[PDB]
Design a protein around this ligand. Structure first.
Ligand SMILES: [Zn+2]
Length: 356
């Protein structure tokens, strides 16, 4: 099956009073492989809402109900979104005009994303006072997930941070009074019973090294993504621009090579007698190492010359930050540690001097 197909003006989720649809589609809000997101007029309450229509596939439908399961809990504990996660108002199944069945989630009216904010400013650096406000509210959301709910997000990234329209201005620039919302809990997970997983999670640019290495990931995988997000706001640019595992790990090595410790260490050799998902990942990760060292640049093999220049342009972490922003460098250093066991809890990072 495929995605939903809509024209502006048609209605979603028909009911007895509105057989054409309770939610009148107003404008597109965003989309992706998961489905589509439309701004809608709730004909019942006569309020602005956002409806996320999920592509009629059980890969995405199962993720969607996982997101419903999480947002139901977050909404009950934190109804006014004190902890800045997106508020889900409703959920229903929309039987397509064409035949497919679509789960849809109803949300508070959504503003543009943090990625949208960056792109529209030509990926110019985000001012530190505004970066601080975004980081604090984001860290409050992550604290709410990890410690108040034992949930790991696994996909912290600028696209998954939305600006509340009230904080947004018609001149399309955010101040330090901006309010954010952490969104997209379909790839989230509950670690209350099984706290260590080995599935490949997170989008590539924000993926923590332990996910690539197969040593087992947990809540700390979100802190690394947070730290890469912060750097991205400070420079305007995506930190790790690579899709190859070996080169990606070397970019980590190059960036953190002057933070002492901080070296890419291979995972323990797995059982040859194990068809586990952990062993398979560690089996593939150990091919990127020769004798306990990351096999870069010899492991790329032409291309070894392109990887050498790309890694050479990768800046060292200290070099990125201006002298008057040493405190923000210190905060990020407790985030971008290669060993996940040295990363701080989000509650500890909220007490970091950068936030006072
Ligand atoms: Zn300081």
């Amino acid at each position: 099956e495929f995605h939903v197909q809509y024209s502006v003006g048609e209605g979603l989720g028909p009911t007895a009073d509105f057989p054409n649809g309770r939610y009148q589609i107003l404008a597109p809000l965003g989309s992706g492989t998961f489905g589509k997101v439309v701004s809608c007029w709730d004909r019942v309450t006569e309020q602005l809402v956002a409806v996320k229509v999920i592509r009629a596939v059980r890969k995405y439908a199962e993720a969607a109900r996982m997101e419903i399961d999480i947002l139901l809990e977050l909404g009950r504990k934190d109804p006014t979104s004190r902890f800045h996660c997106v508020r889900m108002l409703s959920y229903f199944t929309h039987v397509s005009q064409q035949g497919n069945a679509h789960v849809c989630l109803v949300f508070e009216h959504l503003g543009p994303s943090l990625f949208d904010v960056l792109m529209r400013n030509h990926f110019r650096p985000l001012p530190v006072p505004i970066l601080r406000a975004v980081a604090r509210q984001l860290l409050e959301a992550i604290t709410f997930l990890h410690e108040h709910n034992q949930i790991v997000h696994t996909d912290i990234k600028p696209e998954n941070v939305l600006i509340v329209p009230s904080s947004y201005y018609p001149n399309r620039q955010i101040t330090e009074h901006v309010q954010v919302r952490l969104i997209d809990f379909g790839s989230a997970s509950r670690l209350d019973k099984v706290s260590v997983r080995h599935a490949i999670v997170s989008t590539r640019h924000y993926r923590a090294p332990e996910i690539i290495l197969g040593t087992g990931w947990s809540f700390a995988c979100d802190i690394w993504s947070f730290g890469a997000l912060l750097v991205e706001c400070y420079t305007g640019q995506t930190l790790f621009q690579s899709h190859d595992d070996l080169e990606h790990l070397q970019l980590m090595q190059k960036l953190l090579q002057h933070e002492n410790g901080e070296v890419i260490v291979p995972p323990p050799r797995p059982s040859p007698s194990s068809t586990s998902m952990g062993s398979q990942r560690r089996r593939e990760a150990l091919k990127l190492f020769r004798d306990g060292r990351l096999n870069w640049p010899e492991g790329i093999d032409l291309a070894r010359q392109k990887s050498i220049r790309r890694v050479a342009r990768m800046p060292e972490l200290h070099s990125i930050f201006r002298p008057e922003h040493a405190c923000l460098l210190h905060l990020i250093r407790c985030c971008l540690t290669i060993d996940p066991l040295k990363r701080w809890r989000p509650s500890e990072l909220l007490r970091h001097p950068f936030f006072m």
